[PDB]
Structure 1
């Protein structure tokens, strides 16, 4: 199989900046202690593609997580803050768009390549957080 546009996300990434993440987590409903510990973490994100399957791993002192998925196909996800959600991830004009649904709520996580960075924009209702990753 040949190259895919989504190969631009493949690699090992490290968190270098975070804005408004505590307020985003508050809007999602994350409790005090999890917010405090999760907000300290500086995760590494490892993204790989094998055929139609994309795998995103996150390693940190807070939690280690791994999801594998096919674009447009819903899957079960237990998030780092221990929500059990239904997730669907699609590609929209170069942007990975990840929607998590649970308990009648939903949040959208967008991942995009910007210069040499991977920029993650998390939205819950009117509250947005921006997390920026660089190559490890």
Structure 2
């Protein structure tokens, strides 16, 4: 997981962001940002940073913490290891992160909408 990654592909960004409630103007401008993810894994402890402004989250696998999104939305959750994925279950929100051949793959699911981000390792 440790590394620096840059976003290259994504699935269903529009539908996902609409479902979050963000305006189409914000969705229109924000799509053009390139997100850079920096991860430092020390055992079960993670430092997870997103740049494009900066948002840093610190967490341990199996211990509850508060994840903050890039915009500022905080939420209580416990990150779990499941077969190579980090997993976050939450009221109507499933999210997973994974390394798939030097590529950070991040899936998020709300309702019946699945968002997928693929980022290349730098």
- Which TM bucket (shorter chain)? 0.7 to 0.9
SS at match of 1:109: strand
Q: Where does structure 2 lack aligned partners over 5 or more consecutive residues?
A: none
**TM-score normalized with structure 2 length:** 0.87
| CA–CA separation in structure 1 for the residues paired with 2:100 and 2:67 | 27
Residue 122 of structure 1: CA displacement? 1.2
| CA–CA separation in structure 1 for the residues paired with 2:74 and 2:41 | 24
- After TM superposition, the runs of 4+ consecutive aligned structure 1 residues lying more than 3 A away are 31-34
Contact residue 30 and residue 81 of structure 1 kept, 8 A: no
Contact residue 48 and residue 54 of structure 1 kept, 8 A: yes
Match of 1:116 among 91, 102, 105: 102
| CA–CA separation in structure 2 for the residues paired with 1:87 and 1:36 | 29
Q: Where does structure 1 lack aligned partners over 5 or more consecutive residues?
A: 1-8
Residue 42 of structure 1: CA displacement? 0.9
Residue 26 of structure 1: CA displacement? 1.4
Residue 33 of structure 1: CA displacement? 4.2
Contact residue 34 and residue 81 of structure 1 kept, 8 A: no
Residue 108 of structure 1: CA displacement? 1.9
Residue 39 of structure 1: CA displacement? 2.1
Aligned length: 122
Match of 2:20 among 16, 23, 28: 28
Match of 2:68 among 64, 68, 78: 78
**TM-score normalized with structure 1 length:** 0.79
